[PDB]
């Protein structure tokens, strides 16, 4: 894969190659892939390879990354939540 | 004990393109 | 996403944002999502977003969380099992 | 060496609502 | 979930509550569940709850557990592989 | 760096029973 | 499971028994299995067991393995990416 | 805090055989 605008990756604290869960609001597909850095400020959300069978252009998707951490850190860690407009620009 | 927790979420993005035969 | 009554989250030792597996006894759907804290004592089990394609109102579901732990702790750790009545109140 | 173990189980809850278009 | 004969759990080095992947040779279903200790020497392989929609009595299955381990241990670790007869007794 | 490796395999077991409405 | 030519396993830095995600470009199937070392230089990509229901001879597939690492290493880590010809030989 | 990152990729290999009844 999934190509993501570098601005959304920075906003969400995603690294190139980080595992990402894509869930498709339009058809209910759910899959696991990895993040590729896309042209900054382009608003690109690109589905690459076999994932393109399940997730299509024009679909609304949610992109999720998880982390494993010890009980103590889990109770204090604050996730990065990024809301976007119809053009995939942060709000 | 390690828990799996939400780290990152991009909420309601629009898929702009797809390439079945991506090379990279 | 899954909105869970804060009482069931305390009873089950679940944090807001902890990864959760939902399995649907009615139709056999299985998916991975994260826990959101719901109104305490409301008995809410709320499916939000893409998951609503697979899990429907009135379905009987099992909600599961896993932990990664060293061999030593794994042999002694006791999981929190919460049984609930028809109104999603603990027993 | 880390194992994945069951930590939490809510058994046979009834889904009370579902919302495709939830925002939050 | 999956109820497993305590002898197969010992043979395979599985703990009660350990996450288990079930793969079904008959219909190609693949799912994730956790191990429950079954009556020792009974040859029980019991599918409990939502999983019973996907994996059925008389199906040939493979049960898999994974561990996360450091690169160094991964190169030397020897998995426990348990072959069974038609009655789920180890060989 | 942690890798995910095979730890346990029970090969070609026969499912003996199923219960949709199991409690436990 | 998946039998892989030992040359591709060395090229990709994959161990026997390492968890592998297979994604099928032809039919969009996605599954998780583990790597088995295949005859070196044979170009073998062998689907064994339940996976054969989903992934068929002549299908184009992508094989993916992941690693868990601390934030600091994650920002610098470079994955092993292996391109292959029509005969499954590295380029 | 542990991240899951891509470690290995074999890109666009051709499946050479399939065996439903493999033993090993
Ligand atoms: O083809 C895909 O869907 C794809 C490509 N590269 C990695 C992964 Cl996990 N999936
Ligand atoms: O709509 C969904 O199912 C959804 C929403 N937010 C996160 C996840 Cl994993 N899923
Ligand atoms: O009904 C099931 O599939 C089930 C029951 N309890 C736990 C899990 Cl993970 N799955
Ligand atoms: O037959 C399969 O698909 C299979 C074989 N061994 C392990 C796993 Cl996870 N799957």
Asked if B3 lies within 8 A of C69 by C-beta distance, the reply is no
Query: Quick count: other Cβ atoms within 10 Å of Cβ D24?
Result: 10
Q: How far apart are CA H17 and CA H24, in angstroms?
A: 16
Resolution (A): 2.2
DSSP character for G55? S
The answer to whether D7 contacts chain B (CB < 8 Å) is yes
Give phi and psi for G39, each to the nearest 5.
-50, 125
Q: Pull the structure tokens for residue G90.
A: 């590295």
In sequence order, what are the residues at sequence separation of 6 or more whose Cβ sits closer than 8 angstroms to the Cβ of residue A63?
A2, A4, A12, A20, A21, A22, A35, A45, B8, B9, B10, B13
Ligand 4 center–CA G80 separation, angstroms: 24
**Would you call C77 a catalytic residue per the annotation?**
no
**Would you call E77 a catalytic residue per the annotation?**
no
Cβ atoms of G43 and G77 closer than 8 Å: no
In sequence order, what are the residues at sequence separation of 6 or more whose Cβ sits closer than 8 angstroms to the Cβ of residue A72?
none
In sequence order, what are the residues at sequence separation of 6 or more whose Cβ sits closer than 8 angstroms to the Cβ of residue C60?
C24, C25, C26, D12, D13, D14, D15
Q: Is E33 touching ligand 3 by the criterion CB < 6 Å?
A: yes
Asked if F23 lies within 8 A of D2 by C-beta distance, the reply is no
Atom of ligand 4 nearest to the CA of E25: 1
Q: What share of chain B is helix, strand, coil (3-state, %, to 5)?
A: 0, 65, 35
CA of A36: how far to CAs of A40, B11, B16, B22, E58, in Å? Answer: 12, 18, 14, 12, 44
What's the per-residue H, E or C state across C62-75? EEEEEEEEEHHHHC
Q: Is C31 touching ligand 3 by the criterion CB < 6 Å?
A: no
Per CB-CB distance under 8 Å, the chain A contacts of C18 are 74
DSSP character for C26? T
Ligand 3 center–CA A81 separation, angstroms: 30
Report the nearest-CA residue for atom 7 of ligand 4.
G1
The minimum CA-CA distance between H4 and chain B, rounded to whole Å, is 11
Per CB-CB distance under 8 Å, the chain A contacts of G65 are none
How many residues make up chain B in this entry? 24
Any bridge partners for residue A3, and if so which? A36, A46
Per CB-CB distance under 8 Å, the chain G contacts of H4 are 66-68
Q: How far apart are CA G3 and CA H7, in angstroms?
A: 19
Q: Which of C3, C47, C50 to mutate to test the pocket of ligand 2 (most atoms within 8 A of CB)?
A: C50
Per CB-CB distance under 8 Å, the chain H contacts of E25 are 20-21
Handedness of CA G67, G69, G71, G72 (dihedral sign): negative
Residue among E1, G51, A63, H3 nearest B2 (CA): H3
Residue among D13, A28, D8, D16 nearest C46 (CA): D16
Residue among E71, G29, H20, E25 nearest F10 (CA): E25
DSSP character for C42? S
Cβ atoms of B16 and A43 closer than 8 Å: yes
Q: How far apart are CA F1 and CA F6, in angstroms?
A: 16
Cβ atoms of A61 and A55 closer than 8 Å: yes
Asked if G43 lies within 8 A of H16 by C-beta distance, the reply is yes
DSSP character for B18? E
Ordered structural domains, chain C, with CATH? 2-91 (2.40.40.20)
Report the nearest-CA residue for atom 1 of ligand 4.
G49
Ligand 3 center–CA E39 separation, angstroms: 19
Any bridge partners for residue E4, and if so which? E37, E45
Cβ atoms of B6 and A32 closer than 8 Å: no
Q: How far apart are CA C88 and CA G33, in angstroms?
A: 37
Give phi and psi for A35, each to the nearest 5.
-85, 135
Helix (H/G/I), strand (E/B), else coil: A50: helix
Q: Which helix (H) or strand (E) holds F13?
A: strand F2-14
Name the experimental technique: X-ray
Q: Which residue has the tokens 């209910």?
A: A28
Residue among G50, G69, G72, G47 nearest G58 (CA): G47
Residue among A36, F20, E78, C32 nearest G64 (CA): A36
Cβ burial H1-24 (10 Å sphere, 16+ → b, else e): ebbbbbbbbbbbbbbbebeeebee
Q: How far apart are CA G36 and CA G4, in angstroms?
A: 6
Q: How far apart are CA C14 and CA C20, in angstroms?
A: 9
Query: Quick count: other Cβ atoms within 10 Å of Cβ G31?
Result: 19
Q: How far apart are CA C89 and CA H8, in angstroms?
A: 46
Cβ atoms of G21 and A31 closer than 8 Å: no
Cβ burial E30-66 (10 Å sphere, 16+ → b, else e): bbbbbbbbbeeeebbbbbbbbbbbbbbeebbbbbbbb
Residue among F21, E50, D18, D8 nearest C90 (CA): D8
Chains B and F touch (3+ CB pairs under 8 A): no
The minimum CA-CA distance between F18 and chain D, rounded to whole Å, is 17
What's CA E80's distance to the chain center, in Å?
11
- With 0-12 / 13-18 / 19 or more C-beta atoms within 10 angstroms meaning exposed / middle / buried, residue A42 is middle
The minimum CA-CA distance between A73 and chain H, rounded to whole Å, is 8
> Would strands D2-14 and C80-83 be described as parallel, antiparallel, or unpaired?
parallel
Cβ atoms of A4 and A37 closer than 8 Å: yes
Any bridge partners for residue G46, and if so which? G3, H17
Sheet holding F17-19, edge to edge: E36-38, E3-5, E45-48, F17-19
- With 0-12 / 13-18 / 19 or more C-beta atoms within 10 angstroms meaning exposed / middle / buried, residue F18 is buried
Q: How far apart are CA C26 and CA C33, in angstroms?
A: 18
């Amino acid at each position: 894969x999934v190509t993501i605008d570098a601005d959304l990756m920075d906003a969400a604290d995603l690294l190139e190659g980080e595992q990402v869960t894509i869930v498709d609001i339009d058809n209910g597909a759910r899959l696991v892939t990895y993040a590729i850095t896309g042209e900054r400020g382009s608003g690109v959300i690109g589905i690459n390879g076999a994932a393109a069978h399940l997730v299509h252009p024009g679909d609304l998707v949610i992109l999720i990354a998880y982390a494993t951490m010890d009980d103590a850190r889990a109770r204090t860690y604050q996730p990065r939540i990024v809301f976007v407009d119809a053009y995939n620009k942060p709000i | 004990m390690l828990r799996t927790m939400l780290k990152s979420k991009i909420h309601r993005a629009t898929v702009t393109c797809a390439d079945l035969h991506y090379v990279g």
